[PDB]
């Protein structure tokens, strides 16, 4: 509650960031109903650092905006847990310290954390991505740097599919398209158990890669409570996949299954690529919900915590810099990672052939995994012409070559033009003519 | 493909004594201009099948527009199981039931009201290990109706160095029970886990030797990493070596998740794996409309097997409502939720530990609405607020639950003792309004 103790308005915040040894925090905060402004972000830091009921380990509030409900607060960087073990951070103290029990507050209408900004000395203690979308760049015969669109998809139904069924499914994806996600429930259903279905997929893999000369990746779903069971599920994969174990991402729906989830996998398969899927994020992370933390927060905590890539969502933009760039602005926050690897934006849904380099441009680099659902493959020869059409489409972006010209040497990619009329006489007028289609 | 999702002619008596569904109770209202039926058959599909492979399909069987009530029966083979052991996962329950359908499309808001899990899949569940019990042998009472275990926090939440923590717990004993890390407390670089546990484990030597009784601590070993989290465990339980049965393994199991309450549970069956809700209040609060409700929370945790699990802290909303069925569901055999009666087939009980302000003069009429005294309370106000002290504070709620137990007016009691007869004093309000003019009673 004590103020004086807690408060310290008058601290440049450019001086907490020039002396790096404060978390810096960013939430937009109501006082409950009658209840002083700075009085409660007095009691919020108090109740996030040292409470009381020695100060020099005191959360200190140093900005205030109440017309706004804007409160900043400063955490010492001795507040955070470390590992007795190897001595790194773990990302659940920094959640406790910064969202416990000030999630509960009478007192407190709302907060919601939409900003944080992490020193070098503290930054550098988290484990951080061990390998990207490089690693996938180097499956697929692409460069290191700048290796472009990987396209993929979801295998619907989402569950009821048998193992030859959903093996079979694969492989007709797999002739078109890159990657292939399990949908957040498919593992070791009774009427299709993962040890059956993986060997079925790991066989489709092997069919695919030989029929069409281009290797094939699959994100396998390895989520459950207890870790060893996690563990099983990706030595199964990896062994059964065999000499295709580098073409394999571990799916962990890391939301649902917190963070010890995404902790195991990351330290325990530095070597494939961690997909971290947010099932049920939305329950935080939702603009209808004024309480916990957004989806900006929830992403560039997944770096920290090592997410190879992560679904990002369709700014969608602020959320990509800050994952893929050594330094990026956030919504209050301006932030360095000292050379900590990018965790890859996995974008959904999708657009056709055509809509494709309007992304591409507005982002600035087709550096992202597709995770398309069926109607970003709607095409008129079929959803296989469907894929390659969205791969030309990125060929073209990159070359710098004009669809139109590209699309009279590519089939597929010229008639996603007939496949949308009414998108191409509107997007590339001409193109009837154009392309004497 | 909507209307293959929804099936209001299913009877739910048939459904529960048919044992092959999961039964959700949802408080969901579709966006403007979407009719109910379709709306609910969409989240059905979504959270099962979906399309956009039909014996699977969940089905909508009943639903009450006026009421913002969807009630889904999702068949059992759906959830995933272990391919190590075939046991069942709380993860994927939470992905089917709630996750994917928390922002869909026509649905503005869904929140899960209470569960029903059948007889086969409920025994898949690891359910816990221990509970109250092992606290109750450990203290010497009686393993069944033994009472409470009065603890507290370590205030300041952080900042005590080894030392000075270890005197402040040592004093604490002198009165009460138990000794609980606040949330936050490890490894920070001011107070190594390391020291301060090997001090600890000798103020907990001290204490039981000076009190002649048997002394509680829960030491926090929340982390990220599993390893982390065994190798804390394994610290804690050998520094404490003789005294490893009288510690409580603390796991901030909202914040690190279902994995870090899953590790403590099966690397360490034998102690009380006491799981502490912080972050929690996001979802679970009355004022989100969406995620779930506490009740649903406490009932999740029961099945994944945590030992006791913090409740009712109250705060100061002194109407009243819910939060009840709570303490039945959590340790009855048997219990009404807000829409099904569950039957837990001898699955172990989870243990309440209350908070806050439970002074000794509100603590009866808190045992006599309960119906028992079985619970960990760990006292702030009750404590503190004593004017001789937290340690009178301590022996004031004990002394305060004998009372109870034994059938013995408080005014009578507080008369033998003094300790009792000062919380009167110490708390003023509270003895107006409960004890009608105590003043005569007790002397001034
Ligand atoms: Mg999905
Ligand atoms: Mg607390």
């Given at each position: 509650?004590?103020?004086?103790?807690?408060?310290?308005?008058?601290?440049?915040?450019?001086?907490?960031?020039?002396?790096?040894?404060?978390?810096?925090?960013?939430?937009?905060?109501?006082?409950?109903?009658?209840?002083?402004?700075?009085?409660?972000?007095?009691?919020?830091?108090?109740?996030?650092?040292?409470?009381?009921?020695?100060?020099?380990?005191?959360?200190?509030?140093?900005?205030?905006?109440?017309?706004?409900?804007?409160?900043?607060?400063?955490?010492?960087?001795?507040?955070?847990?470390?590992?007795?073990?190897?001595?790194?951070?773990?990302?659940?103290?920094?959640?406790?310290?910064?969202?416990?029990?000030?999630?509960?507050?009478?007192?407190?209408?709302?907060?919601?954390?939409?900003?944080?900004?992490?020193?070098?000395?503290?930054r550098a203690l988290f484990d951080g991505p061990s390998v990207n979308i490089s690693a996938l760049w180097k499956v697929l015969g692409r460069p290191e740097v700048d290796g472009g669109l990987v396209v993929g998809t979801i295998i619907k139904p989402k569950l009821g599919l048998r193992p030859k069924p959903f093996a079979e499914a694969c492989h007709a994806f797999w002739l078109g398209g890159d990657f292939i996600k399990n949908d957040e429930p498919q593992g070791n259903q009774p009427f299709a158990p993962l040890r059956d279905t993986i060997a079925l997929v790991a066989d489709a893999m092997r069919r695919a890669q030989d029929e069409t000369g281009e290797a094939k990746l699959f994100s396998a779903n390895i989520t459950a409570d207890d870790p060893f069971e996690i563990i099983a599920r990706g030595e199964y994969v990896l062994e059964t996949f065999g000499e295709n174990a580098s073409h394999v991402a571990l799916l962990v729906d890391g939301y649902v299954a917190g963070a010890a989830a995404i902790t195991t996998a990351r330290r325990r398969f530095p070597d494939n690529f961690l997909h971290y899927h947010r099932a049920g994020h939305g329950a935080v992370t939702s603009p209808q919900s004024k309480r916990g933390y957004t989806a900006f927060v929830h992403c560039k905590m997944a770096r920290l915590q090592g997410a190879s890539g992560i679904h990002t969502g369709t700014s969608d933009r602020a959320i990509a810099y800050m994952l893929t760039q050594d330094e990026a602005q956030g919504p209050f926050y301006r932030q360095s990672w000292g050379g900590m690897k990018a965790c890859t934006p996995i974008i959904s849904g999708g657009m056709n052939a055509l809509r494709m380099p309007g992304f591409?441009?507005?982002?600035?680099?087709?550096?992202?995994?597709?995770?398309?659902?069926?109607?970003?493959?709607?095409?008129?020869?079929?959803?296989?012409?469907?894929?390659?059409?969205?791969?030309?489409?990125?060929?073209?972006?990159?070359?710098?070559?004009?669809?139109?010209?590209?699309?009279?040497?590519?089939?597929?990619?010229?008639?996603?033009?007939?496949?949308?009329?009414?998108?191409?006489?509107?997007?590339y007028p001409g193109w009837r003519k154009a392309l004497g289609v």
């Open positions: 509650d004590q103020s004086s103790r807690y408060v310290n308005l008058a601290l440049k915040e450019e001086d907490l960031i020039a002396g790096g040894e404060h978390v810096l925090c960013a939430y937009i905060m109501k006082p409950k109903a009658g209840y002083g402004y700075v009085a409660t972000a007095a009691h919020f830091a108090a109740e996030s650092s040292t409470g009381t009921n020695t100060r020099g380990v005191d959360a200190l509030v140093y900005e205030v905006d109440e017309a706004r409900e804007l409160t900043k607060i400063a955490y010492p960087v001795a507040l955070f847990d470390r590992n007795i073990t190897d001595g790194k951070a773990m990302i659940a103290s920094f959640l406790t310290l910064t969202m416990g029990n000030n999630q509960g507050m009478g007192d407190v209408e709302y907060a919601k954390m939409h900003d944080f900004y992490v020193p070098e000395a503290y591409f441009e507005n982002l600035g680099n087709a550096n992202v995994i597709l995770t398309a659902g069926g109607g970003a493959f709607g095409h008129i020869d079929g959803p296989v012409a469907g894929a390659r059409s969205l791969r030309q489409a990125w060929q073209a972006w990159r070359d710098g070559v004009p669809v139109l010209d590209y699309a009279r040497e590519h089939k597929e990619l010229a008639r996603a033009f007939e496949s949308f009329p009414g998108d191409a006489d509107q997007i």
